[PDB]
RNA sequence: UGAGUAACGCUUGGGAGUGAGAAUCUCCCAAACCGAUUGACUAAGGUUUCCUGGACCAGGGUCGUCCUUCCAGGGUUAGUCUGGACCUAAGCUGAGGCUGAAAAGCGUAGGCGAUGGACAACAGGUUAAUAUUCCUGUACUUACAGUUAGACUGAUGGAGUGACAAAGAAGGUUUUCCACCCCCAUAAUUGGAUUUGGGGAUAAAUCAUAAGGUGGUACAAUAGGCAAAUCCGUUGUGCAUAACAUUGAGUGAUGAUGUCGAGUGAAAGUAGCGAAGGUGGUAUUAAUCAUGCUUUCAAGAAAAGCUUCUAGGGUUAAUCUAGCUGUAACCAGUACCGAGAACGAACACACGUAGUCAAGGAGAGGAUCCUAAGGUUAGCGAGUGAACUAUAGCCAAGGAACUCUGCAAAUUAACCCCGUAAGUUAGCGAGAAGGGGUGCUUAUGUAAAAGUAAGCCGCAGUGAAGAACGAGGGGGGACUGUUUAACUAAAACACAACUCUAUGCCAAACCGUAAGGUGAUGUAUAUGGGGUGACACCUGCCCAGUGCUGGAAGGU
RNA sequence: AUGAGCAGGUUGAAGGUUGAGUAACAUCAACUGGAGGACCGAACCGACUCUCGUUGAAACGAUAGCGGAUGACUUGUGAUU
């Protein structure tokens, strides 16, 4: 059957990307938290 | 007039009808002028926020709006000529292509009766009364079918411009302004004597009797399905619930929201236009 | 259970018999499973016995069985049979072949057997 | 014209196969940001032969060393092949 | 422990070789499925999985010398291809600005945003791996100067074009196809043959030729096209019946003394060799002309770009047009997979995923049975042929008695010819019901064929496969549709139509706190809401209570 | 918003041209024309029934049947609530 994750990299980048998250207050806050927890994969822009 | 559509497609029977569109129009083949066409973006009942605000509206076809000179103000005391009576999809009436003698084209509403080669005019002074003309209401004698009226001066034709609509003159008020108008649907307003008007009823008198025959035909015309409140669940409608065809339990019928509905007066009577009214389809003020 | 392999249908058995008899006439030795060897032997014997007379009817009847191999093609294998293999055995009543048992296989512990034919 | 855009040549069987012809297609690896115009001008001012045609490809990075407790990533490089007129040939 | 139990997730036989060891690896020969596909090309994705050499801790439902695994080395080559450097749609963002305790929200100019528009390259070869990219041969384009000749250019702006629906049909031209003919190998021990098998093409571009398609054409006035106008628009006059403008599949010649080619074939069927490389018919087929035409109503994208227009400029020459010489053509993608093993399914999982090419026989066909081009061995086997289970096949006599019910299963089944009721919105019912014929040969058949008469075989002749079971009465809903993904597809929902009510335009209803927006670039023959639900006939009584509307003096 | 797709085969509407007829209509016959939430049926979509599987091949499927299949259709890509 047709599962729940059909991938299309343009959509993924535009939706969870770095320029997507660095344009609203909540996105800036989540980048703050992720720098705080020190994620190596900060957003989905890096593989 | 109207013309039947004998289907002989053996899935149900539909005595569908359609306006003849042949004996009424000129050159039914659709070749509208390019200079006066702008595409319409179909909002589809939606909103700038993207939610739904007007229900069951969507799925209409692609149209092309014809820029109509409802104002009739840039060309005054200058003759014109009706060139074609095309079918513009947006409004129920018939639009006509006129060409002012200097060579300038426009789309107007076709008063019922004018034909190819006729002459129409627009002015500010007393002129003739033949259909298609335009002039301030103070000059049109009482009794003539008048359409494409407008409320504010130099504001272009809002009131009474639908398929087969009109309005009659009924003299003047006691002030010396405010020519009275007997509108369609029993009301009677007071229009300012500086308001323009166009004589002659609007064409396509038989749009009341065209019968959409199949649900589809209606879906393509822009009206999507409407669901009765008694089919709803008790949530998202006041009429929901009930274990099988229960009636409208609350004391009066209700809207999809919680508003009392049936016959409850709604006009905002604290408005400037209440004193420009003689009657409101039933009685005084 | 449902979808299942076609398996050892009767056509599979008979076609295996044909391929193995072709192979044994072509070379003269087969290293197969024992319980296919005992089943190939019967058809082998019947062919060699039917092939000692050499009229065209026998050629037709043997054409119904043989298949071409890398060594000989079918119309070469027929000549190779009727020229040297069949007449060699012309005086032996039965007993045209032997099946001797080899050692068990490492893959399946099946009883490998060798099929051959000598005077 | 820093000529920092000629990092290295690569010597492979393919390069020799293409080089022993008549066109004498040399090959180099260049700065990942460099462009064909800069490459051919650099070649002009490093050797002295105005090149005919320049071609560039880039080998995107992949996984390297596979499974070795410290898997790594390869190197992004732009290989530019450089063509030369029929009767000329130079060395590195 | 259960237990060395269930499971091991669609398929074979052998020869030769390797290797310590082989069902499992390499080669060969068959064999068995696929063939509107398990074949070929690519988009999306994935991210080295691709090629060569080596290894066999682990992963592979067994094994393994082997793997899409691991290790070392390697491969992706563009002025013209997909996209940027050009264009815009939905929409997104959004200077100033509007609104909002705060963050933010809305939104104008501008800017982004392909799934679309515009833009110039074809054929063949080559490597283990790339190819309109490299190479060979022949081309075109867009800029740049310098030069020869002609000409006054004519935009950030105006106009035209671009610029468009769905369905249907009929024509033109090449083709498919049919026939003939040149060429090649073949000449046959199983009775007989005096044949049998295969192939028969060459591109963009340049020049001439183009059947046919579209749409009047010239001249004069001009008050409009934010100014300007020789352009467009408008109004007059003549020719008209074809001139003019514009477009145009195909044809021929160059390209081509080239490449390719059935086959042959040395040191692997590879290198090299490489004959014909054609004529007619065409009542059949697809493709192009075609953004063509006709009809209908649900009335069928924008901008850039191209042509033009004047303004603006230019003459002591700028700018453009045509040619010659020379120079330049940037940035990312380009491997491989594209799924019964590389994508999404936790996997080497029976599932899913856009588009393109799509052979032959019978046939209406992309159905159905078998095959071709090509491609795979469904990564546990070997036996035995007990109960028992699934799946197929078959079952005398009876033929629905089992049963909750004829659930399931069975009969009919394509084509051709007769014939076909009750009822009705007069369309249907109806493929109604009910029946018959079907194969091969000869002759007749028309232009091919169906058909026709005679004859012949079999138990049976769409001999196989793939094709409706039917009649009669009743309830519900009018119908076609939608629905509870993953137990309910229904008598529910929808619907056409009816009525009632609200609403006079800054409409009413609605989202939002407000701005703003829909309703609507709509205007009572219109829009929102409640209720019924095609079509026909009917829709009785009660206004005390609740609700709704109005009331004008009083009471609180 | 924008694009693509629906092998093949039938029924043969409205309208129109002609002839009769009509005082002229109406009506009838032939020919053309090629409509339809039409018909039969593959790809495509959906999911009515049995059987199987139900620690499955599969966190909802297979064989065999089944309804629609030019339309209120199906589908990809992008945006949005
Ligand atoms: Mg036990
Ligand atoms: Mg047991
Ligand atoms: Mg077992
Ligand atoms: Mg699959
Ligand atoms: Mg597909
Ligand atoms: Mg076929
Ligand atoms: Mg098939
Ligand atoms: Mg109801
Ligand atoms: Mg009812």
Author numbering:
A (entry chain 0): 1 to 47
B (entry chain a): 2 to 286
C (entry chain m): 2 to 120
D (entry chain s): 2 to 93
What's written in the study?
Translation of genetic information through messenger RNAs (mRNAs) into proteins is performed by the ribosome, one of the primordial macromolecular machines in cells. The ribosome consists of a small and a large subunit (30S and 50S in prokaryotes), which form the aminoacyl (A), peptidyl (P) and exit (E) transfer RNA (tRNA) binding sites at their interface. During the elongation phase, the ribosome undergoes a fundamental cycle to add one amino acid to the nascent peptide chain, which can be subdivided into three steps: decoding, peptidyl transfer and translocation. Here, we use these technical advances to perform large-scale structure classification and spatial analysis of ribosomes, to visualize parts of the translation process in great detail inside M. pneumoniae as a prokaryotic minimal cell model.
To investigate the structural details of the translation machinery, we first obtained 3.5-Å consensus maps by averaging all ribosomes detected in cryo-electron tomograms of intact M. pneumoniae cells (Supplementary Discussion and Methods). The high-resolution in-cell consensus maps allowed us to build de novo an atomic model for the M. pneumoniae ribosome. Specifically, 11 of the 52 ribosomal proteins in M. pneumoniae have extended sequences compared to E. coli. Most of these extensions are predicted to be disordered, but those of ribosomal proteins S6, L22 and L29 form secondary structures and were built in the model. To investigate the effects of antibiotics on the cellular translation machinery, we analysed ribosomes in cells that were treated for a short time (15–20 min) with two representative ribosome-targeting antibiotics: chloramphenicol (Cm), which binds to the peptidyl transfer centre in the 50S subunit and inhibits peptide bond formation; and spectinomycin (Spc), which binds to the 30S neck and blocks translocation. The Cm molecule was resolved in its canonical binding site.
